Amino acid sequence: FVWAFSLMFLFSGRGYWQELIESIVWAHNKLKVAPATQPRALSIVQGRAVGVTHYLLGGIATTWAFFLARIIAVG
Amino acid sequence: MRDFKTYLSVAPVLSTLWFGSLAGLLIEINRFFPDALTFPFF
Amino acid sequence: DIAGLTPCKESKQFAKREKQALKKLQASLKLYADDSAPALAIKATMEKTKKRFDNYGKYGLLCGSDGLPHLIVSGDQRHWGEFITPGILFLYIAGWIGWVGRSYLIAIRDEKKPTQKEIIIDVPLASSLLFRGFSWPVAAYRELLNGELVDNNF
Amino acid sequence: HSFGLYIHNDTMSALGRPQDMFSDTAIQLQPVFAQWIQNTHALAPGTTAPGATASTSLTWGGGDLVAVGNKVALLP
Amino acid sequence: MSHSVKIYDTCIGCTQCVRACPTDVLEMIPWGGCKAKQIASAPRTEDCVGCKRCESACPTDFLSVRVYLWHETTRSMGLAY
Amino acid sequence: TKRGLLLKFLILGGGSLLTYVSANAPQDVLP
Amino acid sequence: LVDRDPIKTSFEQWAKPGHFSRTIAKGPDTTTWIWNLHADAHDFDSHTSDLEEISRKVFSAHFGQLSIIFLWLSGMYFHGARFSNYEAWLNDPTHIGPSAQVVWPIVGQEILNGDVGGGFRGIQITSGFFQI
Amino acid sequence: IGPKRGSKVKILRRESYWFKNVGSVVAVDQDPKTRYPVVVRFAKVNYANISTNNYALDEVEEVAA
Amino acid sequence: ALRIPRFSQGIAQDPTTRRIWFGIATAHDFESHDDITEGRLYQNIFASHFGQLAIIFLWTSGNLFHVAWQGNFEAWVQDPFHVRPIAHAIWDPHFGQPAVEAFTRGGALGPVNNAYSGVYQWWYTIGLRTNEDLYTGAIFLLFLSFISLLAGWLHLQPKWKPSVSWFKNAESRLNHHLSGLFGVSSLAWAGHLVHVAIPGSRGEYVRWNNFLDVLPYPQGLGPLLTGQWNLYAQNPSSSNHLFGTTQGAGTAILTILGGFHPQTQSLWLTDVAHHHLAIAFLFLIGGLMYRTNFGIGHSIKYILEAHIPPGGRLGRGHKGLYDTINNSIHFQLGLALASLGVITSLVAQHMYSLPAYAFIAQDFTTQAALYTHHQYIAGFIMTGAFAHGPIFFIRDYNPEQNADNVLARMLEHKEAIISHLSWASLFLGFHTLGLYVHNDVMLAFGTPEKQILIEPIFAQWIQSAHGKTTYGFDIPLSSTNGPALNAGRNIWLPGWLNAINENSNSLFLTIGPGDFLVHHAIALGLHTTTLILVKGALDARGSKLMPDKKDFGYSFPCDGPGRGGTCDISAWDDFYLAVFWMLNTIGWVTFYWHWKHITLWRGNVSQFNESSTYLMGWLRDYLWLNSSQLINGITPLVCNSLSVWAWMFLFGHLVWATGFMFLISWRGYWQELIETLAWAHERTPLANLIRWRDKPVALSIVQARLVGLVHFSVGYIFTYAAFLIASTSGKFG
Ligand code: CLA
Ligand code: CLA
Ligand code: CLA
């Protein structure tokens, strides 16, 4: 699953989740609940950092599981 | 030593002594009643 | 009673689940603990999912085919507190998560330079605005909609 | 030469004419791999080599079998 | 447009503000009153590529430019070669 | 080497006889 | 920075917004700098423009690996010990199918703990201690 | 000091980051003359690393008042 | 350095390759590219899609033309027992001699591939039968699909007007259409089914000769004009029928009577025609609703204008929504898209449980690769709908000309709109996902009990107030009687809408906790999908990060780094981003039917029951169970049954994967090594002088967000394509 969450971090823009993070920030202000600590989207390359790292800890333990499950028990 | 109108600070993740624990006491209610799925009352 | 079947008072399919399945649990004619003091399938893990006999309480609890129990909660025949009882509970708990969200927050933006007091925490959990939540009788259910957060501030 | 190689197979084994795949047996290779360097590794305890029954790594071409009495281990 | 991205602002002062950007921007063209009195948005832009290094620094307070030029030479992308 | 207007000629001609008879056949030897 | 540099305070820097390039984390609030701080936490274009220290940090904050690899291994030797199966497995190899870890039967858990050899409930191993 | 110089002003342009929000001011222009006077200032930053901008009275809608 | 591409100009002398690609994908963007005028444009879309209708008949022609000489029909109309129909003759020189192996399918000679399109049960289901009697198809349709081009030109030629202003009426047209068109388009169909087809169905033939001599009855249109209609519906059909051959036929067109049959499911002969008729008044009554010169009816403003229901005294305008939906042409093409989008699924979700064809489900394949090419599309629309109503806001739209006015306010009060949308998703998010891991942590853990599993109450509910006469149950006022209807009974709801539980094909399948999830996870799709489209749209105009985001709105993909860091923040790249969830809903949904159906056929249903209430299992039995057939079909042991499919299915997994480049690559890295890789040639012999005419470059910074996609998609959509088929065909079901 985690792998199939990477693509979202890998495949997407950036002033996007901004443009989104405000709609949010708006609804936030009405109740009086947001501004302090200017909430901000991911640092273009952070975004790539949260690709990749996930794509691997996803796509990898997948087999770490796939494996231990076909040598324990016959094999 | 703490009276009235807010107090002293605390760290970055005292949340890691708040996820772990508090919450942790709750397994502690999830074995006292080792089970749920509705619940009797008091 | 409703779409699935009846509770525990009878539920054939459910019974078979009790029994095979768990009890095979068994499955290990022995496997050595004749007197031995660790390997605890033996005691409970079964018996704690098991002595859960023809009793589980009794809960009504509808149980469809394969007799895994389904949750209606439409407030009738028996099933009311499978959502509301643990529903208002979810409400009351949250909301006293964020009543204090809108609190160890609306207590700061003032005095002198208040620009991230929040990456550290002034009163931990707030431990001051704390009980404001159980010390909500009525509360936001009036003073939210009248004054303070008043349409003004809207 | 390094992937569409496989894709041949599909396209032509799903087309289906094995005559012409790349099988360990259709495209010309004939019931032996052997003559390279593996076969001059398990067999080298007869050079400047002193020796000592078997090889260096039991997985090599030449000689021996008998490895283990529960399950298996390594062989050629 | 063919190089049309607006970095304008209001100060168009350029001290500890902005300089960066290969050739394109020979400004300081003082308009009859705008504080440190040097203004506008460019000089003759038919020369270089498509940065937004253009802001990154010294205000545009609105947008900031980027690629928008379309009609796009080559000299206008490194690669005509 | 009379190339003075051609190629359209050799791409109906040559390529209708690398494909006309080239596909057809009087008794399969099938796919 | 600027704070007290001097010569004139053992008094440690706990309190006063920021540090890490110089119109730094600014008074003015933001979030980006909280992934900043962890990221690039180790780096060297900042800390000082002068080698010196850095090799004086890396030979230290190195160290705490060995020590760790060392707190680790312990909980593995302990583990590969009193959460036994090693005694049991050795008189009895070809036969066993080893364990070191075991749950505690809280909530669902236990299914994870399933007869492994010298007569006990646990979760197996593919990390060849029991064999060093 | 006698009228009002720079004591509380909203912004109303819709481009300007803290637009509808009211922060604080400073040395608002004196003379008859130009069109971009008034500095304003507030806590909250904006999309650039530094944000402390100058808008101008054709507008500042403050509005009441 | 020459001049080329004949419409644009910036593009035209661009020395690279962009020259090409970007040529072949600005073509259809008439509004604003060199060659254009509001007069040009319109007409330049008019004799365009007269180039439409045109290409739809060279499709349909051939559909009816690989069928008439081979591709069984004077077979499959002898009795259509579920064994392998036919499309056309597969002919590839690459084929092995296992040309002989199935692939080569029974009746016909050389190999072939069989109708999974429905056509074969509707070229049949409106009669159309005999293999001497049949071989028309192209012949007409094509002596049609050429006319389709002729206006194209005729109406392109100035003189006999191509018409310019006349393109912004409405009233006249649509005062014309939803009568002239639809109404009579119905009617005329009502015509055909009934004179030539209903007879061809229950009854007997119609001979190409007579058309007067044939008379559904003895004494003609009898009364009919004599307001006396009723006595159509008495002994209409029967049931001891033998479909197509009378005998228990009877002959009284129209009904609502009888119903289902083990010998054909499918809507009754008649009913699809009184209906076709019945609606054909309403639209004709509807058509004639607006002006068109004579001086009756309506002006399409003045009933907007100050119409307004809750307006009136709530300070919220309504100004010329007409001269903005009319002066827009995009508002146009996206109120167009949707309606079609919403109904493309209403088509295709009703086309099951109510298929109207002679042998269909109880076919159960064609029935399952046909709900979806109508679920794909349909989803595929919707997006484009939502995507031309974020172009209206930029190229067209006009804040000074729309304001206080309710299209505004929609803009104005927008920040909420995405939020009270996003609040749906985030809720609809983790709450579906508690229920499904929990449901999967509990199995595996040994405890099938403890499983969280809500009955779908308000579902089944809708149906115990219908016909789901499942194991009794009162309901306060209903009981299962005392009050029934009282006001209704033996008219209307006869045998029909009385399928009940019918474990085989009951219409309504009997819903439990397995369905109270997917059904909340198709709901987390169109919501999320649309917070992004709503958003995508609700400011192609601009916002805080990019305030002045316009004069080009749509695809300006990218912007400079700095400000916060700015990216896929063109309303296109949110469309771009949208199309992944339209490709994830339109999958949860389709995925669902089938598993269900599958199981609900050559076997159980308990299967989907306790094994769709969780997640792993959705992968194991379905996904993992039921592929079997296909893949051991290239098998180390020769090409068996299917081979097209599995090779497609891996063609499926490649086209997909190979999306990713495009997608995790981003022009920068590509261009640069092409900078080194175009130092080769220039520097290498036997490949010098040799000039390109287009300068080697790497793909545009919007282009590859597309291409990975338009790539992600086929792969993906070409994998289920071959997946379902490759397993609804075998079965077991
Ligand atoms: C993007 C793709 C596209 C494609 C490729 C297809 C393909 C198909 N669709 Mg389809 N469809 C689509 C989009 C598409 N559809 C959309 C967007 C909708 C929603 C509007 C539908 C709604 C739909 C329905 C409801 C059905 C199909 C069916 C079909 C299949 C029938 C073959 C056919 O269409 O011949 C098309 C035939 C024609 C174009 C000629 C007939 C048109 C008649 C009505 C013209 C009447 C004009 C007449 C001359 C006026 C008379 C006036 C005077 C004589 C009185 C075929 C698989 C059918 C099916 O179920 O197959 C099993 C049917 O169920 N589709
Ligand atoms: C049913 C109709 C409908 C109509 C009448 C139009 C009409 C128009 N659209 Mg449009 N559109 C639609 C549905 C429609 N659209 C839908 C459903 C979507 C997404 C669901 C879009 C998404 C879209 C975008 C992004 C744009 C348009 C644009 C346009 C305008 C220019 C067309 C163009 O760029 O094509 C030219 C394209 C080509 C000549 C071919 C290249 C297309 C590629 C992507 C191939 C697509 C996949 C393909 C089938 C896979 C290859 C096949 C494989 C078997 C090998 C024109 C006004 C453009 C515009 O003007 O907006 C400002 C543009 O932005 N549309
Ligand atoms: C399987 C996928 C993965 C996941 C988990 C998500 C999840 C989400 N996407 Mg997303 N996406 C993905 C792949 C994924 N996406 C891909 C491949 C693409 C295209 C390339 C997209 C394109 C896309 C768009 C355009 C949007 C989203 C949005 C969203 C959010 C919608 C709200 C929602 O569904 O409930 C909330 C989320 C979930 C149910 C997922 C789980 C999140 C929680 C429960 C984390 C678990 C906490 C855990 C215990 C702690 C672990 C962390 C650490 C301490 C170890 C959600 C966060 C939208 C959005 O922003 O909503 C406001 C919208 O912007 N996505």
Ligand code: CLA
């Ligand atoms: C399945 C994959 C798809 C394919 C086919 C490729 C192929 C390639 N990638 Mg790549 N890539 C992909 C997905 C893919 N990538 C993804 C998803 C990512 C990131 C998520 C990347 C990230 C990446 C990077 C960073 C790099 C590449 C590079 C390359 C090239 C390496 C050299 C090579 O062997 O190419 C040629 C061989 C193939 C593409 C495989 C064979 C294709 C078969 C099907 C034969 C078809 C030919 C035949 C004549 C078809 C014509 C018939 C007619 C009908 C058209 C190659 C073009 C690198 C490069 O360019 O170095 C040389 C570069 O380093 N890729």
Ligand SMILES: CC(=CC=C/C(C)=C/C=C/C=C(C)/C=C/C=C(C)/C=C/C1=C(C)CCCC1(C)C)/C=C/C1=C(C)CCCC1(C)C
């Ligand atoms: C009638 C109905 C309905 C509905 C519902 C509905 C009625 C729905 C709707 C839908 C629609 C849609 C969903 C659309 C969408 C679209 C849009 C929203 C658009 C947008 C846009 C943009 C983006 C911007 C501008 C442009 C445009 C506009 C395009 C129903 C009825 C019924 C029922 C059911 C119950 C019973 C009875 C009956 C009677 C049977």
Ligand SMILES: CC(=CC=C/C(C)=C/C=C/C=C(C)\C=C\C=C(C)\C=C\C1=C(C)CCCC1(C)C)/C=C/C1=C(C)CCCC1(C)C
């Ligand atoms: C939904 C969830 C979860 C999920 C989850 C999932 C669904 C998944 C996850 C995953 C994770 C992971 C995955 C991590 C990890 C890990 C590890 C430990 C790893 C390891 C390894 C290594 C060592 C390397 C590589 C390989 C491997 C991977 C094996 C949750 C939810 C929730 C809620 C309701 C609310 C509150 C909170 C919570 C309670 C939280």
Ligand code: SF4
């Ligand atoms: S805003 Fe930029 S370049 Fe513009 S005037 Fe200032 S610094 Fe000059």
Ligand code: SF4
């Ligand atoms: S921003 Fe534009 S004009 Fe300025 S330097 Fe960059 S490319 Fe040149």
Ligand code: SF4
């Ligand atoms: S893509 Fe890269 S470069 Fe382009 S805009 Fe985004 S960040 Fe900038």
